[PDB]
Amino acid sequence: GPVPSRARVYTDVNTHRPREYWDYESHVVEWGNQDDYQLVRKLGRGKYSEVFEAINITNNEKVVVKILKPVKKKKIKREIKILENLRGGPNIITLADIVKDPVSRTPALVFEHVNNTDFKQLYQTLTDYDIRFYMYEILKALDYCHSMGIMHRDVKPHNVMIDHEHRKLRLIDWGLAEFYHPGQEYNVRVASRYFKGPELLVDYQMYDYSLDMWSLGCMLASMIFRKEPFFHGHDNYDQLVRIAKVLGTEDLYDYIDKYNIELDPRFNDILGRHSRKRWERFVHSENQHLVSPEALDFLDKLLRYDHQSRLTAREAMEHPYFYTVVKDQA
Ligand SMILES: CC(C)Oc1ccc2ccn(-c3cncc(-c4ccc(C(=O)O)cc4)n3)c2c1
């Protein structure tokens, strides 16, 4: 069978907490009053929810309501518990309230309003400094949630809200997040295809916080190289092929050997043999102003097959790429 793995950091953080912190199945949801909110307009739709701008009529505050499509009570409890545990943490979206439609019995999460600028219009405006700044802000949220025993498991641009005028950022959509427990075998069917870590793609279930760091690396690559998505796979199998064409097959097969991973036979046809590419092949006159030795060194240290060898969030924050950001923040 596969070789076990443990997180290098924050390994036992949940074991040391009271059971109630992580044992979300036992959480009792306190429902507020749906009549306190009036819906104003629809903001967006997902697979599993619809998001509206609303007003809290008790105090006239603008709020956001995420009405859940039908999902298991345990998964709703998980998201609520995680949001409550992380409330007040750096750059974490604040859950303000939880309500039910009395007739249709559908649950709705009520959040703080963030004045988001279209992240699909915000990447053509981003300077080198801006990317470093916002990356640092995301790392603060990830170090925090990891330190609190939580993997986000769905890091990607859609789940980062930015109020550019206020240089404000929030990490949202905790619906896939999970508590880290040493030894636990997780579902690999998480995250968007383009952001999935090698561990997911090869079906290695004993993963950890380091998944988030792969996803972050994918984001960074897409931003500095102006190539969204960076690893553009056609399906989950081809996704690993696209990664292998960059990181190379030698390190991939080393990873599978180290963890005694049983690779789906389907892969044997399509993976082939690929050299590890230098990052210089993605640099061009359009993106060169975003790319530095520091950026490439940092990126290289996020995008590793071996989850254990990726930078931690706290290590990433200490990287020379962020020296200018750190100097200004005091
Ligand atoms: C599906 C959702 C992310 O789509 C949108 C689209 C446009 C906009 C424009 C503003 N928002 C907005 C403003 N303030 C907060 C949020 C929000 C907050 C949390 C979550 C969540 O799940 O955790 C989803 C959305 N959202 C939008 C949300």
- The domains found in the chain, sorted by start residue, are 5-22+114-330 (1.10.510.10), 23-113 (3.30.200.20)
- The CA distance from 262 to 307, in Å, is 17
Helix 249-258 vs helix 236-247: crossing angle, to nearest 10: 110
Shortest-distance Cα residue to atom 8 of ligand 1: 43
- 154 as an active site residue: the answer is yes
**154-266-207-192 Cα dihedral, nearest 10 degrees:** 0
Q: Best substitution site from 68, 79, 113, 172 to test ligand 1's pocket, by max atoms within 8 Å of Cβ?
A: 172
CA of 51 to the centre of ligand 1 (A): 6
Collapsing DSSP to helix, strand or coil, 197 comes out as coil
CA of 156 to the centre of ligand 1 (A): 14
CA of 12 to the centre of ligand 1 (A): 33
Number of H helices, E strands in the chain: 11, 9
Q: Is the CB of 80 under 6 A from ligand 1?
A: no
Q: Which atom of ligand 1 is nearest to the CA of 114?
A: 14
Collapsing DSSP to helix, strand or coil, 209 comes out as coil
Q: 129: how many CB neighbours lie within 10 A of its CB? A: 11
Catalytically annotated residue among 97, 154, 173, 208:
154
Shortest-distance Cα residue to atom 27 of ligand 1: 43
- The reply to whether 46 sits in an annotated binding site is yes
**Residue 42 to residues 228, 270, 289: CA-CA distances in angstroms?**
27, 43, 38
Question: Is residue 157 within 8 Å of residue 119, measured between CB atoms?
Answer: yes
Question: Is residue 19 within 8 Å of residue 179, measured between CB atoms?
Answer: no
Q: Is the CB of 114 under 6 A from ligand 1?
A: yes
Helix 210-225 vs helix 128-147: crossing angle, to nearest 10: 170
Q: Best substitution site from 161, 162, 166, 173 to test ligand 1's pocket, by max atoms within 8 Å of Cβ?
A: 161
Resolution (in Å) of the shown entry? 2.6
Instruction: Please name the residue ranges forming H helices in 53-112.
Output: 73-86
Which contacts of 251-256 are long-range, i.e. CB under 8 A and separated by 24 or more positions?
Answer: 251/276, 251/304, 251/305, 251/306, 252/198, 252/305, 254/305, 254/306, 255/198, 255/202, 255/305, 255/306, 256/202
- The reply to whether 43 sits in an annotated binding site is yes
Strand partners for 37: 56
Instruction: Please name the residue ranges forming H helices in the chain.
Output: 19-22, 73-86, 128-147, 198-201, 210-225, 236-247, 249-258, 266-270, 293-302, 313-317, 323-328
Collapsing DSSP to helix, strand or coil, 291 comes out as coil
